[PDB]
Design a protein around this ligand. Structure first.
Ligand SMILES: CCCCCCCCCCCCC/C=C/[C@@H](O)[C@H](CO)NC(=O)CCCCCCCCCCCCCCC
Ligand SMILES: CCCCCCCCCCCCC/C=C/[C@@H](O)[C@H](CO)NC(=O)CCCCCCCCCCCCCCC
Ligand SMILES: *CCC(=O)Nc1ccc(C(=O)NCc2ccc(Cl)cc2Cl)cc1
Ligand SMILES: *CCC(=O)Nc1ccc(C(=O)NCc2ccc(Cl)cc2Cl)cc1
Ligand SMILES: CCCCCCCCCCCCCCCC
Ligand SMILES: CCCCCCCCCCCC
Ligand SMILES: CCCCCCCCCC
Ligand SMILES: CCCCCCCCCC
Ligand SMILES: CCCCCCCC
Ligand SMILES: CCCCCCCC
Ligand SMILES: [K+]
Ligand SMILES: [K+]
Ligand SMILES: [K+]
Ligand SMILES: [K+]
Ligand SMILES: [K+]
Ligand SMILES: [K+]
Lengths: 268, 282
């Protein structure tokens, strides 16, 4: 009958405000640092090359920033990657359609492929879940006849799910990404989380740089994208369940606190 | 029982996998066909300009022009207006733009025009995503449920206005799906698209493109509703916030309905091919 939606809306607004403050705190300093150390560069390149005017260099900069949309972008490999970024809704954006017909086809392609890929991803997740059900069935039998509790064997099994999944789907792909892309470890894990959450900023792409790949590589990361999107769907849903549980525990904690203030003053 | 169903399940998922591969191949072919020509045109017409700059400044070290463009492309990923005429700008990380960024994280739209460069920014972004995505999921579920109850009451009366001669119970459902589609596409894509065109200066197709790319959470970032430096009446960005919330709910509904359409067409086509081979010329 009632909402409950208003309080979670307010919680989301609060979460966004806290996040915005923290992000500003962590990111504005390096931004102003790079801004002043590039206004150093604009006039240290110009005085080191007197033949460039102060206004012809700006013609150069204007056309280079005009080249923001191009720099092939559209070999069958890169367009296959793009189609993947569309139907997965990752949408890195490093590749994007510029002609109107490309955008119209992109609209149709998204509206049809997102549900179809949803079916594929659901099936992949179900098959992984049954494989993992048998896998937990055996270690839930070795460790099961010792008196250990039953409603905590499930939390030990979630511990094992999280750990094994994050080593197979986050850890070793991250180390491979660092050894192949040249990314840092933190940058690799960042890429993993941002792509498998379907956020997909595009500041890092697993086949973007020119660095020449082993050709065994893009298909394997395709497979990793498929299986990791499923794993991360599971992880995000279980975090949601964590949230609803802690939500009711906090609801009862506020109930208890106000109930201990209630008749604590009836103590007259 | 426990296993005899799983063979069937792995069969259907394998054929869905092959269908997805085929869809990706077709899409890639069409996209290459539609986008590579203008790309090579612009590339040769940018090297025309590159050596028009080169056939005008030999005193320039002439190979450092490309390291200069390297540093310019490195500087633009952390947005900049790098010209002497105007050394004054507005920052990527005011609380407004950082609020927008946090939204792009928890919605998983991820436009990317703004993204964390600091190590701590990336670690906090990881934590922020892993916690906010489910939370925003709950919010969006509530928004969708309330929208659905408003629309249920709205259709309840038009489910009687139409009770003339010859009327159905389970086939009036198609007029209700038609009304959902049309009214939703008027409120959540159409008029927001025209607003986006008149305020952002985007084309009509660019506005609708932005709408579709944003509410599906693809979020390329090639168009952003608050990106350009312009005025923005502030009566604008909060209403676009609200539009994002309710339109994400609406588009989740639309995508689920398209999925149902696909499931129906899939089973009708398999039974149709069964029927075909069962005939197979007399
Ligand atoms: C990382 C960014 C910072 C996160 C900011 C979260 C601050 C919010 C802390 C709880 C206070 C919410 C206000 C209302 C609380 C209750 O009246 C209400 C039900 O009565 N709770 C909920 O609805 C259920 C809402 C429960 C949502 C809790 C979100 C989980 C945060 C995880 C971070 C914990 C770090 C612990 C060390 C600080
Ligand atoms: C299912 C409902 C989703 C519909 C969401 C999009 C609704 C489109 C309504 C916008 C109409 C605006 C009127 C003016 C349009 C022109 O100024 C504009 C050129 O400037 N044309 C287009 O944008 C051309 C736009 C072309 C629209 C693409 C239509 C593709 C529908 C495919 C649906 C999947 C059906 C699958 C059945 C097997
Ligand atoms: C064409 C220029 C470019 O960026 N090409 C490019 C980038 C990435 C790939 C690729 O296959 N990456 C692995 C992958 C596969 C699917 C998805 Cl949705 C995402 C990724 Cl990162 C290929 C070509
Ligand atoms: C600071 C530079 C910049 O890009 N600023 C910017 C862009 C967009 C907004 C904004 O509020 N857009 C509406 C909106 C709200 C939430 C989301 Cl998740 C996405 C959008 Cl487009 C504000 C500031
Ligand atoms: C624009 C997207 C084109 C992709 C659509 C391909 C059509 C495929 C028709 C069915 C192919 C598999 C049928 C097998 C049924 C037993
Ligand atoms: C499980 C088999 C499904 C095959 C049917 C898919 C049909 C897609 C139609 C796309 C029309 C543009
Ligand atoms: C300018 C309009 C281009 C539209 C291209 C649509 C391609 C349809 C392929 C099925
Ligand atoms: C079922 C075993 C899945 C193994 C996944 C390997 C991922 C490759 C890392 C790039
Ligand atoms: C909770 C995520 C922390 C990631 C730390 C990575 C350090 C290389
Ligand atoms: C319910 C009306 C939403 C209007 C959103 C328009 C903002 C661009
Ligand atoms: K994105
Ligand atoms: K997404
Ligand atoms: K999603
Ligand atoms: K971008
Ligand atoms: K995205
Ligand atoms: K992006």
């Amino acid at each position: 009958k009632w909402k409950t939606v208003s309080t979670i809306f307010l919680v989301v607004v609060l979460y966004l405000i806290i996040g915005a403050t923290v992000f500003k705190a962590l990111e504005q300093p390096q931004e102003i640092s790079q801004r002043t150390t590039i206004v150093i560069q604009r006039e240290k390149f110009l005085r080191a090359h007197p033949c460039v005017s102060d206004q012809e260099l700006d013609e150069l900069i204007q056309q280079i920033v005009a080249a923001i949309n191009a720099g092939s972008h559209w070999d069958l490999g890169s367009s296959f990657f793009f189609a993947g970024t569309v139907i997965t809704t990752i949408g890195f954006g490093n590749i994007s359609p510029r002609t109107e017909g490309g955008k119209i086809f992109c609209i149709i392609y998204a509206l049809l492929g997102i549900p179809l890929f949803g079916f594929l991803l659901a099936g992949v997740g179900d098959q992984l879940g049954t494989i993992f059900g048998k896998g937990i069935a055996k270690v839930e039998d070795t460790f099961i006849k010792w008196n250990v509790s039953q409603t905590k064997i499930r939390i030990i099994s979630t511990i094992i799910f999280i750990l094994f999944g994050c080593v197979l789907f986050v850890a070793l792909p991250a180390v491979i990404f660092k050894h192949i892309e040249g990314w840092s470890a933190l940058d690799a894990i960042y890429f993993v989380v941002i792509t498998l959450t379907t956020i997909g900023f595009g500041d890092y792409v697993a086949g973007g740089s020119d660095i020449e790949y082993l050709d065994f590589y893009k298909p394997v990361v395709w497979f990793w994208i498929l299986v990791g999107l499923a794993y991360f769907a599971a992880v995000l849903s279980m975090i949601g369940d964590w949230l609803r549980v802690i939500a009711k525990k906090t609801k009862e904690a506020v109930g208890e606190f106000r109930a201990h203030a209630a008749e604590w003053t009836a103590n007259v």
